[PDB]
């Protein structure tokens, strides 16, 4: 089991960490969602589907910088919504193919009432998402840590 980003940054068997740089809607009004859909940028696969089933959760999602200060967050994982920053490990998604499958994580971030102006700074860390991979074969319990960075400013109109 290993993962890679759209631009080809890899985290190999056994886990590790990588930086993910995301383009964000440049203007987001109060009452609207800023959507950060990581399923278009993070992909994983099973290296031995003939014998092994891989299990993958969002173990933890943390918010940083402007997202922590200026947004009210929800994370959608494989079709179900949970609070973000997260309060529990998600259910598992099964990985059972050698063909790359997206990691079905999307953040939905809506501005809090106090938010206004540059609510997310370009280049800033906005989230850390921990992918936890286990299997039905051995005791492997690996963390794939995704550090999410903003590519651009996000303005919340006032």
Ligand X SMILES: CO[C@H]1O[C@H](CO)[C@@H](O)[C@H](O)[C@@H]1O
Q: Which is nearer to ligand X, 48 or 89 (CB)?
A: 48
Torsion of CA 14, 11, 99, 90, to 10 degrees: 70
Residue by residue, DSSP assigns 135-149 as: ESSS---EEEEEEEE
The reply to whether 146 sits near ligand X by the rule CB under 6 A is no
The least CB distance from residue 43 to ligand X, in Å, is 14
Question: CA 145 to CA 27: how far, in whole Å?
Answer: 28
Closest residue to ligand X, based on beta-carbon distance: 1
Residues 58-87 that bind ligand X (CB under 6 A): none
Q: Is the dihedral of CA 107, 119, 121, 67 positive or negative?
A: negative
The reply to whether 90 sits near ligand X by the rule CB under 6 A is no
The reply to whether 47 sits near ligand X by the rule CB under 6 A is yes
Which of 106, 108, 116, 140: binder of ligand X (CB under 6 A)? 140
User: CA separation (Å) from 95 to 44, 48, 78, 146?
Assistant: 8, 10, 12, 18
Residues 5-24 that bind ligand X (CB under 6 A): 13
The least CB distance from residue 119 to ligand X, in Å, is 38
The reply to whether 46 sits near ligand X by the rule CB under 6 A is yes
């Amino acid at each position: 089991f290993a993962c890679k980003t759209a631009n080809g940054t890899a985290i190999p068997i056994g886990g590790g960490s990588a930086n993910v740089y995301v383009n964000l809607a440049p203007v987001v009004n109060v009452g609207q969602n800023l959507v950060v859909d990581l399923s278009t940028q993070i992909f994983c696969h099973n290296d031995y589907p003939e014998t092994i089933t891989d299990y993958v959760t969002l173990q933890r999602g943390s918010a940083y910088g402007g997202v922590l200060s200026n947004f009210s967050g929800t994370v959608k994982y494989s079709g179900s919504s949970y609070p973000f920053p997260t309060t529990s490990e998600t259910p598992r998604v099964v990985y059972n193919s050698r063909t790359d499958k997206p990691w079905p994580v999307a953040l939905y971030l809506t501005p809090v009432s106090s938010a206004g102006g540059v609510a997310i700074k370009a280049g800033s860390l906005i989230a850390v998402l921990i992918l936890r991979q286990t299997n039905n074969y051995n005791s492997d319990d690996f963390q794939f840590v995704w550090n999410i960075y903003a590519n651009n400013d996000v303005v919340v109109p006032t």
